[PDB]
From a paper:
The purified GATOR2 and CASTOR1apo were combined and the cryo-electron microscopy (cryo-EM) structure of GATOR2 bound to CASTOR1apo was determined to an overall resolution of 3.89 Å. The two MIOS subunits straddling the ‘front’ face of GATOR2 engage the CASTOR1 homodimer, while the other two back-facing MIOS β-propellers that do not engage CASTOR1 are disordered and are not seen in the final density map and reconstruction. Compared to GATOR2apo, this movement in the front-face MIOS α-solenoid and CTD domains results in the disordering of residues 757–836 and 890–921 in WDR59 and residues 727–746 and 770–783 in MIOS. Two MIOS loops are responsible for most of the contacts with CASTOR1apo. In CASTOR1apo, the MIOS-releasing loop is disordered, which exposes the negatively charged MIOS-binding interface residues Y118, Q119, D121 and Y236.
Mechanistic target of rapamycin complex 1 (mTORC1) is a nutrient-responsive master regulator of metabolism. Under low nutrients, including arginine, the GTPase-activating protein complex GATOR1 promotes GTP hydrolysis on RagA/B, inactivating mTORC1. Instead, a series of dedicated amino acid sensors that include CASTOR1, sestrin2 (SESN2) and SAMTOR relay information about amino acids into the pathway through the intermediation of the GATOR1–GATOR2–KICSTOR complexes.
Author numbering:
A (entry chain M): 340 to 357, 395 to 402, 408 to 458, 626 to 790
B (entry chain L): 390 to 443, 450 to 475, 483 to 487
C (entry chain Q): 2 to 90, 100 to 254, 262 to 321
D (entry chain L): 682 to 746, 770 to 797, 812 to 863
Write the structure that this text describes.
């Protein structure tokens, strides 16, 4: 006669025989902040390690911060053997992964790249990447998930983003497909990518209503729909009703 | 004319359909031709609305009075409308 | 934990509550043949955005599907059916397919993990666990029964293995609530073998002879071994360590809690698979967590 | 409310087009859009600007105006957002619930054709400056301005 289930954010619903529905709310705020404010690429290894360590120390994760600093010293340096710490780095990655902290393991894998990629097998790396991506998507952190996918050291995880994400656009006047890298119609010889607001060629981002088949610059359409409910091109369509 | 058009567009001139006659106020300046045109358009819109409540009017006086037959001119101007066509 | 009550307004006892994938939505099924979907707003209050009659008999379990397949709900009931409900946009929920293969009551229904596609497993009271599949995720009105497994015991709970690793074969555990005087294992674990393309009984937990009311695989989330939580007269946690045909596991019990002092009805892991909540006949929710020495301890007692 | 013969006259439509060109020259784009709405309401013969439309990869028919994320013609899955990996779609048929919010509209870079939800890619390009799809070096937002 009882029901029980945690939610994502630590809240817990518990319905039992009197039946009374109670949500025992609290958790993972550290995970959200950590995922949001690491930098995984675009800077040298030392800078990335110091930034991540500063994040971990600010959030109160002293062990994570010292791990980042230790990685910086180990990698970004009558000397120690070149592969002296590889076993220890692998053990640290496995230690963080086996306790549910897949975020730290994936971040270290991405930051280090090939320095540790060849030492961890592909299957475990893919498992960590997928677990971290699922955690990020649960918290609705799409930007961090896509950054991880783009910077993923595994080819299979990288290919997860290129599946059915290409749009085939056609000219309305000619009803024929357009070139894959174009902004002018092949047949009609008309700038079919004209913004409905500014009447300028939309070379980059194009937002398109599915009702009236009209659109334009993403910012321009956003502003117009913020200021009105009609189609900017003027087809009597309430594209975003109310 | 370009600056006047800019100012009128900034003031939403001619876009008011609640009562069209106010558009000449939105024109900024006192233009007799604009005022006459907008008052005529308002009158014809009012006639269309009244007819709908209880096409040809938009054709203008020339087309309206073309079918006006059967009127007798008054020889004497007595000094004292419904008798008209 | 801070407790807050919800005005369920359910005509009978609430049998199951299941959050969605994102944690922002809820689905509660009761014995009044009604399933209610709750969506919370920025104010934090849970609003019942949908309430429709589903089945003829009491509805036992309601489970969510991954959002990539859309807002999809599967509910099993006493009328030997497991219906699949989809949301179409107001908030209208439509029945897609009624799964009528089971000849007896379907105790539990659970969606398979995302990496398998859209697969559904239903366990019936006659000992048959049926695993379905939708070949086309855009056509939820067509479900094809892939496998059916005879568990030789009255099934009461199932739990997929949420591991997304390619090193772990598909695995479904089946618990039984049968109370026969004879002492036989009440939990059977079946692993899908790619070579045979058929589910085969991999491991059997002989130590569990009491009736089982709920089983729950722990979210793998980067681990290498599988952790299973079992609800019985006590709370047991088993760790399944694969060794280097069905895979052989070094089954070790790592927890056995009688703090409920009564029958434990439900067990539910959290997102990280680190804290386990158990709800027993005492009406208390006991959160169990393991320290770095693998000594599972109670981190809180929660009362209605 | 002129008769369709007057609205079909070359001179009237030429004056309308010249006024719209003047409005574009002054960058009165929103006011030009308001005038376009007014003209479409009053003159049904004013065909709206013909812009691009998305076509199903398999059927090839237009997906413009029953799963929302499926092509209306061949019931095939629609292209998915490069960020949330959820198949894109928009239900088709005031102070009411927005049946089709802006943050769910189809949105793609016109150069690399990689697409996603409007809100998702808006946030992504607010944060980053590269195409979300892996192995694509296009700078989608930098192309426009
Ligand atoms: Zn064309
Ligand atoms: Zn524009
Ligand atoms: Zn339009
Ligand atoms: Zn539209
Ligand atoms: Zn199609
Ligand atoms: Zn998206
Ligand atoms: Zn691209
Ligand atoms: Zn691009």
């Amino acid at each position: 006669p009882e029901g029980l289930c945690y939610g994502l954010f630590g809240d817990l619903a518990f319905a039992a025989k009197e039946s009374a529905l109670s949500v025992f709310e609290t958790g993972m705020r550290w995970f959200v902040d950590t995922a949001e404010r690491y930098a995984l690429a675009g800077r040298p290894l030392a800078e990335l390690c110091d930034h991540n360590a500063k994040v971990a120390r600010e959030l109160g994760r002293n062990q994570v911060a010292q791990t980042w600093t230790m990685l910086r010293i180990i990698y970004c340096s009558s000397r120690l053997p070149p592969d002296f710490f590889g076993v220890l780095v692998r053990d640290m990655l496995h230690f963080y992964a086996e306790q549910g902290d897949v975020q730290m393991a994936v971040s270290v894998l991405i930051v280090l790249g090939e320095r540790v990629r060849k030492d961890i097998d592909e299957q475990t790396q893919e498992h960590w990447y997928t677990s971290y991506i699922d955690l990020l998507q649960r918290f609705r952190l799409w930007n961090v998930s896509n950054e991880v996918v783009k910077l993923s050291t595994s080819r299979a995880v990288s290919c997860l983003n290129q599946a059915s994400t290409t749009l085939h656009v056609n000219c309305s006047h000619c009803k024929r497909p357009m070139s894959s890298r174009g902004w002018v119609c092949d047949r009609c010889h008309r700038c079919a990518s004209m913004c409905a607001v500014c009447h300028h060629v939309v070379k980059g981002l194009f937002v398109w209503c599915q009702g009236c088949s009209h659109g334009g610059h993403l910012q321009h359409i956003m502003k117009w729909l913020e200021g009105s409910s009609h189609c900017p091109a003027g087809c009597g369509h309430l594209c975003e009703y109310s | 004319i370009a600056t006047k058009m800019r100012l009128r567009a900034l003031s939403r001139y001619g876009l008011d359909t609640e009562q069209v006659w106010r558009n000449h106020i939105l024109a900024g300046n006192e233009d007799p031709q604009l005022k006459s045109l907008w008052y005529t358009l308002h009158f014809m819109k009012q006639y269309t609305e009244d007819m709908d409540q209880k096409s040809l009017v938009y054709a203008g006086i020339k087309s309206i009075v073309k079918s006006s037959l059967g009127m007798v001119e008054s020889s004497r101007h007595n000094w004292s409308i419904q008798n008209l066509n | 934990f801070v407790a807050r009550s919800i005005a369920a307004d359910h005509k009978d006892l609430i049998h199951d509550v299941s959050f969605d994938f994102h944690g922002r939505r809820m689905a509660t099924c009761s014995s009044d043949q009604s399933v209610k979907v709750w969506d919370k707003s920025e104010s934090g209050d849970w609003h019942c955005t949908a309430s429709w009659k589903t089945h003829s008999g009491s509805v036992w379990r309601v489970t969510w599907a991954h959002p990539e397949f859309g807002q999809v709900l599967a509910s099993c009931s006493f009328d030997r059916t497991a219906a699949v409900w989809e949301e179409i946009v107001q908030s209208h929920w439509v029945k897609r397919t009624t799964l009528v293969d089971s000849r007896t009551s379907v105790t539990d229904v659970k969606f398979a993990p995302k990496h398998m596609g859209l697969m559904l497993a239903t366990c019936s009271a006659d000992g048959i666990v049926r695993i379905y599949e939708a070949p086309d995720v855009m056509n939820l009105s067509q479900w094809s029964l892939q496998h059916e497994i005879s568990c030789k015991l009255s099934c009461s709970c199932i739990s997929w293995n949420p591991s997304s690793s390619r090193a772990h074969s598909p695995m479904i555990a089946v618990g039984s609530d049968d109370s026969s005087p004879n002492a036989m294992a009440k939990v059977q674990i079946f692993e899908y073998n790619e070579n045979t393309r058929k589910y085969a009984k991999a491991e059997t937990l002989m130590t569990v002879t009491d009736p089982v009311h709920d089983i729950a695989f722990a979210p793998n989330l980067g681990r290498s071994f599988h952790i299973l939580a079992i609800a019985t007269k006590d709370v047991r946690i088993f760790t399944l360590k694969p060794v280097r045909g069905p895979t052989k596991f070094e089954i070790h019990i790592v927890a056995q809690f009688d703090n409920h002092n009564s029958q434990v009805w439900r067990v539910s892991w959290n997102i990280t698979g680190t804290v386990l909540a158990s709800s027993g006949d005492d009406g208390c929710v006991r959160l169990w967590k393991a320290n770095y020495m693998d000594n599972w301890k109670c981190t809180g007692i929660l009362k209605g | 409310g002129s008769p369709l013969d007057v609205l079909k006259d070359e001179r009237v439509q030429y004056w309308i087009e010249n006024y719209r060109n003047l409005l574009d020259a002054w960058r009165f784009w929103h006011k030009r859009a308001e005038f376009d709405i007014h003209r479409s309401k009053l003159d049904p013969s004013s065909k709206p600007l013909a812009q691009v439309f998305v076509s199903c990869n398999f059927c090839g028919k237009s997906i413009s105006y029953s799963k929302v994320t499926s092509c209306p013609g061949c019931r095939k899955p629609l292209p998915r957002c490069a960020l949330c990996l959820i198949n894109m779609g928009t239900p088709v048929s005031s102070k009411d619930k927005k049946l089709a919010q802006f943050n769910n509209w189809f949105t793609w870079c016109h150069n690399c054709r990689h697409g996603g939800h409007a809100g998702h890619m808006l946030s992504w390009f607010r944060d980053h400056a590269e195409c979300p799809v892996s192995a694509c070096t296009c700078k989608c937002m930098q192309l426009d301005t």
